[PDB]
Amino acid sequence: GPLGSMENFQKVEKIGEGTYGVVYKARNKLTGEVVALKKIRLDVPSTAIREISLLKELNHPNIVKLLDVIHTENKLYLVFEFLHQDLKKFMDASALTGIPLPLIKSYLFQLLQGLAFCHSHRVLHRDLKPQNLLINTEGAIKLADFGLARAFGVPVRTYTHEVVTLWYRAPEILLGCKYYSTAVDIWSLGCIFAEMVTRRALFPGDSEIDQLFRIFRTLGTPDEVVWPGVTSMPDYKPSFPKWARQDFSKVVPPLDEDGRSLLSQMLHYDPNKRISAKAALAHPFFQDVTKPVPHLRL
Numbered sequence: 001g002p003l004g005s006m007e008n009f010q011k012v013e014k015i016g017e018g019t020y021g022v023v024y025k026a027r028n029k030l031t032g033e034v035v036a037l038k039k040i041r042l043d044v045p046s047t048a049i050r051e052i053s054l055l056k057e058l059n060h061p062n063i064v065k066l067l068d069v070i071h072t073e074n075k076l077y078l079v080f081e082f083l084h085q086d087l088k089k090f091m092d093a094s095a096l097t098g099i100p101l102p103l104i105k106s107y108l109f110q111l112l113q114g115l116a117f118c119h120s121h122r123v124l125h126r127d128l129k130p131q132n133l134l135i136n137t138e139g140a141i142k143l144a145d146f147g148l149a150r151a152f153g154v155p156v157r158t159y160t161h162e163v164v165t166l167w168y169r170a171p172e173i174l175l176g177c178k179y180y181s182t183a184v185d186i187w188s189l190g191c192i193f194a195e196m197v198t199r200r201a202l203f204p205g206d207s208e209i210d211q212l213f214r215i216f217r218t219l220g221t222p223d224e225v226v227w228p229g230v231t232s233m234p235d236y237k238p239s240f241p242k243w244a245r246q247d248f249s250k251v252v253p254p255l256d257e258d259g260r261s262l263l264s265q266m267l268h269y270d271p272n273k274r275i276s277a278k279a280a281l282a283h284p285f286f287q288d289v290t291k292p293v294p295h296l297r298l
């Protein structure tokens, strides 16, 4: 890659990292804009260039705006609108009190709007976690750091938290589905919904098999009765232990029956019965949705 394209930006602090990139807060010297940068070290793929170009076109109020794509030296920089906090820090700050139900409902509604938008363009997020959800003082929440169909970049050696990505993975992914669907995003968001309500991760596995078994112990070991074709999936084993399902009233107390009903549809095993983002927006849980503002300490 050529030189000098990033001289317009002044990095002000390192604010995060992930499998394939380091995140900075930065300022444009020309415009004064404050921005987030994702720095990807390269060893390029044109298919990935086109995927990122399409994401730059996918603009919605509940998707973090991708402002620019800049290649320089052995690096790819993605330039994003800046948001001051992510949902993980907000739940951590709210751990003693919990997030008020109206704000949980607003955040879930907004994220379903962003996903219904993406999914209508046949775009998957693939990597939805609390740290991918950015919030501002006005009460908005936004989807960030979409995963691509094929990754690229030199893995960041200083990043040690990839185990946390298991927690939000859909069972069809864990069972070896190669061409999974927008339903994986609904699963992840369901896990995040339960986490907002209970102030505890729903399925905090630490290996692919522990992740599957944690799902099975709560929702029951899946079989042909509830998921036709599951026993033929590439990583399905007849030797899986057979656990009975638990009740959702144990799983996310004290959530009301509207919320529990919606959560149960977001956590259906079969990606063909799992509720879509659009159908979820019509769920009776949202009959009284409002837009509260969070108390953010920046």
Ligand SMILES: CCS(=O)(=O)N1CCC(NC(=O)c2n[nH]cc2NC(=O)c2c(F)ccc(C3CCN(C(=O)CC(=O)OC)CC3)c2F)CC1
Pocket: 015, 016, 017, 018, 019, 021, 023, 035, 036, 037, 038, 064, 078, 080, 081, 082, 083, 084, 085, 086, 087, 089, 090, 129, 131, 132, 134, 144, 145, 161, 164, 165
């Ligand atoms: C105390 C902190 S904070 O809450 O004060 N606050 C400080 C401000 C900060 N703002 C921004 O970052 C930001 N603003 N506009 C756009 C932004 N970022 C991104 O687009 C972006 C990105 F380009 C790449 C990766 C990530 C995330 C994805 C999820 N992650 C992982 O998968 C790795 C991991 O550990 O998984 C468990 C964590 C990193 C991004 F968000 C949020 C957190």
